[PDB]
Every structure is written in C-alpha cells, then in structure tokens.
Design a protein around this ligand. Structure first.
Ligand SMILES: Nc1ccn([C@H]2C[C@H](O)[C@@H](COP(=O)(O)OP(=O)(O)OP(=O)(O)O)O2)c(=O)n1
Ligand SMILES: [Ca+2]
Length: 425
DNA sequence: ATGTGACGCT
DNA sequence: AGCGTCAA
C-alpha cells in the first residue's frame, strides 16, 4: 500500500492580501467594503483585490471601479503606487518578504505566489511527537476545519467545526505515531501557531490548507476562508472529490482540464478513479496519466522546494487599443523607464540576497494578437545599468520595426523586460 | 481596454 | 533558444 501519506504539506494564502496591506496602513479601511485600484484614468481604475465585505456586494477582481461603485456604492478605494508611468508593487513585495521570513522560522518554504508559500512539515511534526507523548486538546485548534466532518448525529457556522473537530479528536490514535491522521493533526497545531505569529508580528490574516501533499493543501486552504484552516485527510478525499469539480484543481483549470472533461465526458474529480493508468496516459501522455491516476486517488509527489527567492525579476507595461507605440522614440523612452525600475530592483535583490542576474530577457506584444507575448529574445545582463539594459533591449528588437520609415514603429500592445539566469555573488 | 513568475515542450 | 500553459 503506497500510502500517499508520506509527507505533510501545508499551504498558506493571505486573505484579500493587497487590501490588508492598505488596511494596515490606513486604519479607516478596516472592517469596510473596500478594494485595491489601478489607474484611475480608465473607468475609475481596474480592481485587483477585494475585501470580503465588498465580496458580499459581488465586487470582483478584474472590474472597473466605476462599475463596482454601481454594486457597492460606498466602496472605499486604495490606489496603487505608480513608478515612471506604471503601477508599482514595491509595497506588497516588501510586505510579502515579511511573511516569508516568519514562515522560514518554522520550516522550509516554497514561494508559490507573493502571498502564498508551501511548507513540508514532516520533519518538524515528528520532532514534536517525541515531545508530546500525550493527547491533543481542541483549544490548540481554534480555527481548524476538519473536512468531511461532522456527519451522523450545532446549527450555525462555528456551532459546527467544533463537532467535526471533536468527532475527529476522539477517533485519532495518539498511541500510534505512524498514524497519518495524527501527523496532520499535529501539523495543524504547528500551522495554527505560525499563523498566530504572522498576525501578531505583521497584523495580517491568512487561511491555510493542511494535507499530505501540495495539491490537496492548496484546495483545503480555499475551503474555509477567511482566517480559517482546513485539514484534508486521506478519508475525506473520496467523498470530497465525488462532488468536486475538476476545474477546481491546480493545473486542471487550464485547457488540459477542459479537454479532460469533454474527452471523458465527466464533471467531478472522483470520476477519474475508474480509468486505468494506461488509459489516461493514452489520452494525455505518460506524464499526465501517471499524475491524474495518482491525484484522483489523492496522491501527488511533487515536492516542496527550498525556494524562498524568485528566479526571474521582471516588469511589464501594456498599451491597449489606441495607446500602442508607433514611434522609435516612444519605444526608446518606455524601455528605459522599464529598465530603470528593473535596475533598482536588481541592485536591491543583490544587496539582500547576495546574487546577480546574468541574462536579460526582452518580450513584446503586437496588435491583433491574442497571446500574452508574441516575440521574446534573450540578451546578456552584465551591468545593473538602466540605459545599457534598455539600449540592448532596443538593440535585440531594433529590427522588428516593419516600417519603411525608421522614426516610426510597426505597433506594440505590451513590453516586458525580465532579468533572470541569476548567479551567486 | 484589466494590468508577474514558474515551469514544460520542442 | 524561443514558445505555450497555468495560476496568483
Ligand atoms: N490576477 C491577480 C491575482 C492576484 N493579485 C494580487 C492581489 C492578491 O491580493 C494577491 C493574491 O491574490 P489571491 O488570488 O491569492 O487571493 P486574494 O489575496 O486576493 O484573496 P483571497 O485569498 O481571500 O482569495 O496578489 C493581482 O494583483 N492580480
Ligand atoms: Ca490570497
């Protein structure tokens, strides 16, 4: 029996992260229907983050502020810092590197997103079981939800959870330390603990998902939001997946999952457990078949990586519709500004992490082209110089102008510089 | 006309 | 090397 209960993986996401960061800075926005805005010019600005009070009005990410004011009239709005013509997210990066430092103190983290990190707690948990030859109280888990529980023979929201917790806390075997359920339970305490520190030392709230692998830890987190954690066990999986849409799983949100639906003619994840391993390999490849077969039975061996630091530093600028760049001088100018921000971020990164980028990546967009990026060329980053970068960034794309006149440009919907291929310093 | 970053594939 | 997929 290849348990599928080898590791203990947690996943922590900050609840309406960007909003909180503003709410902490501006006290007047806390416990208020509010949102983070970007570029007031076009339609009051596009929304990139929504407080959960404003999520009651139906305000969502990717929506113009003017339109959201029609749903939530008294929607308080914070604005994003702007840098040389573009939005600047230095505040949330600096606010993110805060939380990572804290999660690091407990265990090794994989920076999935800016407000997310994965934690492999196998080592840490076992090193607690020896120091705790004794039961586990419910008071050590005041925000933990046991998925699937309760059931059988407690009316409102926190009325339950308690029962599901109690029903669970009885069933577990504190005697058997190899008991995977016991491990997750202990991890949840450890997760509860680090969460409390995050809120104490930053003032920020977050949800967490605890399970045996990364993908389940992900889904578990999003189950009970906000400021709650959810424990998904091996036993919760079959009953859970049977009603759980496939689109609601990492990687399966894309067109892969779309085909998987219409190819096999299904809806939920539990319906994959029928098909053999070789069948799913026959449709989606040896890699996907092996993965889907394991994952539909709640198994995934994609490991948590010691990667608290990114591998690519980049900044983008989009020029939608008639705002496209049709001169060499606009392009020359913007590439500079883009390279200017990239430089100070690089010199920053260097002074903190003691490392340097070596290869400059340039990427563009044209009009009448759907895909996010059309062309993309590497360079060679040797000097953190906002000019040498952009000048070379121009050089590696100077040819792209299809105009007979050199002063113009034929046009760009987007530009994207990216410093990568790092090296130790 | 919403506006980074990681990874797989050829 | 360049492009495609996926998600925050
Ligand atoms: N397409 C996106 C996705 C995220 N973010 C920013 C804003 C988010 O606050 C933060 C993380 O977004 P999440 O998807 O993790 O979810 P939220 O933090 O917005 O709230 P919640 O966790 O309650 O869903 O990164 C963004 O600007 N654009
Ligand atoms: Ca979030």
């Amino acid at each position: 029996m290849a348990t599928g209960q080898d590791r203990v993986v947690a996943l922590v996401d900050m609840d309406c992260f960007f909003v909180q960061v503003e709410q902490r800075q501006n006290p007047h926005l806390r416990n208020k229907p509010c949102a983070v805005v970007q570029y007031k010019s076009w339609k009051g600005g596009g929304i990139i983050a929504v407080s959960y009070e404003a999520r009651a009005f139906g305000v969502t990410r990717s929506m113009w502020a003017d339109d959201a004011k029609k749903l939530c009239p008294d929607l308080l709005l914070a604005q994003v810092r702007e840098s040389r013509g573009k939005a600047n997210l230095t505040k949330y990066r600096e606010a993110s590197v805060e939380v990572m430092e804290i999660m690091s103190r407990f265990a090794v983290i994989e920076r999935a997103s800016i407000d997310e990190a994965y934690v492999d707690l196998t080592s840490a948990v076992q090193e607690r079981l020896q120091k705790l030859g004794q039961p586990i109280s419910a008071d050590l888990l005041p925000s933990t939800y046991i998925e699937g529980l309760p059931q059988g023979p407690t009316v409102q929201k926190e009325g339950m959870r308690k029962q599901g917790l109690f029903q669970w806390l009885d069933s577990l075997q504190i005697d058997n330390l190899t008991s995977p359920d016991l491990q997750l339970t202990v991890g949840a305490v450890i997760v509860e603990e680090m969460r409390a520190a995050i809120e104490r030392e930053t003032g920020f709230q977050c949800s967490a998902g605890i399970s045996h692998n990364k993908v389940l830890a992900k889904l578990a987190c999003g189950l009970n939001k906000p400021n709650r954690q959810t424990l998904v066990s091996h036993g919760s999986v079959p009953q859970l997946f049977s009603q759980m849409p496939i689109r609601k799983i990492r990687s399966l949100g894309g067109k892969l999952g779309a085909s998987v639906i219409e190819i096999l003619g299904i809806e939920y994840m539990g319906e994959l457990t029928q098909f053999t391993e070789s069948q799913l390999q026959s449709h989606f490849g040896e890699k996907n078949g092996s993965w889907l077969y394991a994952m539909c039975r709640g198994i995934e061996h994609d490991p948590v990586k010691p990667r608290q630091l990114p591998k690519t530093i980049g900044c983008s600028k989009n020029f939608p519709g008639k705002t496209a760049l049709a001169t060499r001088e606009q392009v020359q100018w913007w590439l500079l500004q883009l390279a200017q921000e990239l430089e100070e971020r690089l010199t920053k990164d260097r002074n903190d992490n003691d490392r340097v980028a070596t290869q400059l990546v340039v990427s563009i967009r044209v009009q009448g082209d759907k895909r996010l990026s059309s062309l993309r060329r590497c360079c060679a980053l040797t000097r953190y110089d906002a000019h040498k970068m952009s000048h070379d960034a121009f050089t590696v794309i100077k040819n792209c102008n299809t105009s007979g006149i050199q002063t113009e440009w034929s046009p760009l919907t987007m530009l994207f510089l990216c410093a990568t291929k790092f090296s130790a310093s």
